[PDB]
A paper describes a structure:
Human [name] [name] (hEXOG) is important for mtDNA integrity. hEXOG depletion selectively increases lesions in mtDNA, but has no effect on chromosomal DNA. Human [name] shares sequence homology with members of ββα-Me nuclease family, which contains nonspecific endonucleases. The catalytic Core domain of hEXOG is identical to EndoG, but its C-terminal extension forms a unique Wing domain that converts the enzyme from a nonspecific endonuclease into a DNA-geometry-specific exonuclease. Conversely, in [name] LP-BER, the nuclease reaction occurs before DNA synthesis: hEXOG processes the 5′-end of DNA downstream of the lesion, generating an optimal substrate for DNA synthesis catalysed by Pol γ.
Apo hEXOG is a symmetrical homodimer. Each monomer contains a Core domain that is extremely similar to that of EndoG (r.m.s.d.=0.8 Å), and a helical-bundle Wing domain that corresponds to the C-terminal extension. The N terminus of each hEXOG monomer undergoes a domain-swap where the folding of the region is identical to that in EndoG, but the involved residues are from the opposing monomer rather than from the same monomer in EndoG: the residues 58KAVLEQFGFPLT70 (hydrophobic residues are bold) of one monomer collapse on a hydrophobic patch (277GLVFFPHL284) of the opposing monomer 30 Å away. A Mg2+ is found in each active site, forming octahedron coordination with five water molecules and Nδ of N171. The nature of Mg2+ was confirmed by Mn2+ substitution and single-wavelength anomalous dispersion data. In contrast to the completely solvent exposed active site of EndoG, the active site of hEXOG is an enclosed V-shaped cleft. The cleft, measuring 32–35 Å in depth and 15 Å in width, is lined with positively charged residues from both Core and Wing domains, and is both electrostatically and dimensionally capable of accommodating dsDNA at its end.
Numbering used by the authors:
A (entry chain B): 59 to 358
B (entry chain A): 60 to 358
């Protein structure tokens, strides 16, 4: 109607925004993304892109009045948690840098970010070994709880002067295709984890939800082009949905710390703590360990 | 375009246009984000009857993201129009569409029949002085500050479908005197809490800058409006005066006359009004004694 629209309808700002290796819809009221879609493959998760050189910055395309800023996060007790992981963009330093735009970031628990959420990310990358193409939609969720008088309440903290919303939960929708020629039905799974320290006791399936139920909670329709009348396999039935256990994940963490060891004694402590946990180093750990020891012997 | 092979997720925020209002829906909260309406002298006159309308789900909203009457009834909250039904007396179709729950928000009973209603009346009143009035209404969930400084957003969700109950409501009023007028435009933004508000607060207490409201709601109102141009504050070019108690209490009483189905209930409207230390004006006595003779001609 021209009369209503004479000075324009209000702008919500939810238009899809495309980047090198991810797309997102931004929530200008909460200063966080509504959803972030990415595609993962064997080649994308390989390359020389170094996360150490990347910096968090406001997304230059976002109107500043609706953008978050590093000052909102630093000192707030919450971490800047990627929705599209930086580890999924080793192939392109430009793609990785764009995952450090705050339009891709939500306030996330430190332990969750470096723990259970990281392991889900790793599981998503692992799926590329068994599937050729993997699509992932990540995003925040603000869920209700039942107050003492039975009534359901949504409560969430809001940090910084820009009032960046802290989600109560995080969701991931994983879609995997064996290949573009294959006749095998696609594998899909929806998962919802609280934005807090989880640990190693709960398996990923304990956080699995039906796609319908997640769409009702998030107010979103994921992968709308996907025809649901066809057969879509449960990813936790056709695949494993098993994250790394304590031993494997610690060995993985201790292997990464090798490359940052700036002294020989840092490097032996890494080995020390790994031995104290009775986790025997694997061949890959030793190769990097020996490589770094002679490297550090050749430096001042 | 390998990301799009199976489509980006759907937020469902596209503008939805109706006979006399438009809105953007929030599928997660099951309430509108904003509702824009245009008011004029002609629109607010006509034979469209409110009592012929029913609240119903919006037929164009996906049922999975829609609210239902079962969510509101018994929840302690009223179904509150953003675009009021009273602005569509010219068209029964327009009025019926304001009863789609896509235009509805959980609203405090007193706020809806009281302070918010009075604001709706002031907007209609503007059509005496401005030939065109645009209004954007919607809910707001704002944070409250704990004693330690932490800002917490806390709102209730009602019904099986978890319809969000907002803490505040907002209105953006834009008025133009005429399409041939050199006088500048008039604009104002207001934010009232979603609760009982008495008669002491004047509307200007709840007035906020349009910049602030936009930062709180994540919306850009009237983007095609040039803000470097001559844009006047609505409360300096107009009065921003709501009806006081006596004016409003009389307005409420004159309308309960038309619903009096018996004489004994018709004079109790007179009695309650006199016991309210308000004197019936001519319009009251006019329609009052008319309904009195009408009720003597029935039963
Ligand atoms: Mn992370
Ligand atoms: Mn109302």
């Amino acid at each position: 109607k021209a009369v209503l629209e004479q000075f324009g309808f209000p702008l919500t700002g939810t238009e899809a925004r495309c980047y090198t290796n991810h797309a997102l819809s931004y929530d200008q009221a909460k200063r966080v993304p509504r959803w972030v879609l990415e595609h993962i493959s064997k080649s994308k998760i390989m390359g020389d892109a170094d996360r150490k050189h990347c910096k968090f910055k406001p997304d230059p395309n976002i109107p500043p009045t609706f953008s978050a800023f590093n000052e909102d996060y630093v000192g707030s007790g919450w971490s800047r948690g990627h929705m599209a992981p930086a580890g999924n963009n080793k192939f392109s330093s430009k793609a990785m840098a764009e995952t450090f735009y705050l339009s891709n970031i939500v306030p996330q628990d430190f332990d969750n970010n470096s723990g259970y959420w990281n392991r889900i990310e790793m599981y998503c990358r692992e799926l590329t070994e068994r599937f050729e193409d993997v699509w992932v939609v990540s995003g925040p969720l603000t869920l209700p709880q039942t107050r003492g008088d039975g009534k359901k309440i949504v409560s969430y903290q809001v940090i910084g002067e820009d009032n960046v919303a802290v989600p109560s939960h995080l969701y991931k929708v994983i879609l995997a295709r064996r290949s573009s020629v294959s006749t095998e039905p696609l594998a899909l799974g929806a998962f919802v984890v609280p934005n807090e320290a989880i640990g190693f006791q709960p398996q990923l399936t304990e956080f699995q939800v039906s796609l319908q139920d997640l769409e009702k909670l998030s107010g979103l329709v994921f992968f709308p082009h996907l025809d649901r009348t066809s057969d879509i396999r449960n990813i936790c039935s056709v695949d494993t949905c098993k994250l790394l256990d304590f031993q494997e994940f610690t060995l993985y963490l201790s292997t990464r710390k090798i490359e940052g060891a700036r002294s020989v004694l840092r490097l032996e402590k890494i080995m020390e703590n790994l031995k104290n946990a009775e986790i025997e180093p694997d061949d890959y750990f030793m190769s990097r360990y020996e490589k770094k020891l002679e490297e550090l012997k050749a430096k001042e």
